[PDB]
What does this fold into?
Amino acid sequence: NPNHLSYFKFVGRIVAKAVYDNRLLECYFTRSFYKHILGKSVRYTDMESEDYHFYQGLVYLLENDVSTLGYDLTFSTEVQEFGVCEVRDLKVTEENKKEYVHLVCQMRMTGAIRKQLAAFLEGFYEIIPKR
It folds into this structure.
């Protein structure tokens, strides 16, 4: 849909109207999307629901030495958004991997939905103040 951001802002308006009216909707959003609507970071365990084989890659990253990978990595990942695939920087090391897994999970979760999400939040905060 070429207008999709506007429709996400509309549905965000309808969600904030239901909340303002104190009326229950049959919405069942992910914990990720509620975190996005609260401005909270996601956690790597969220990838388990969104992309199991990437969570599994991170679990091979947790509790294992980088030497198990057999090739080097850096802070960059391929993301499909709107059907375009692009390699995006996240800013690897034993200190950074704590950050690599966080930012790569951000990139993989938001990259493909970052603009839909920002439109929804624009629809939401119009009616219900963020604070």
User: Anything to note?
Assistant: The longest strand covers residues 76-81. The CA atoms of residues 90 and 103 lie 6 Å apart. The first helix runs from residue 4 to 21.
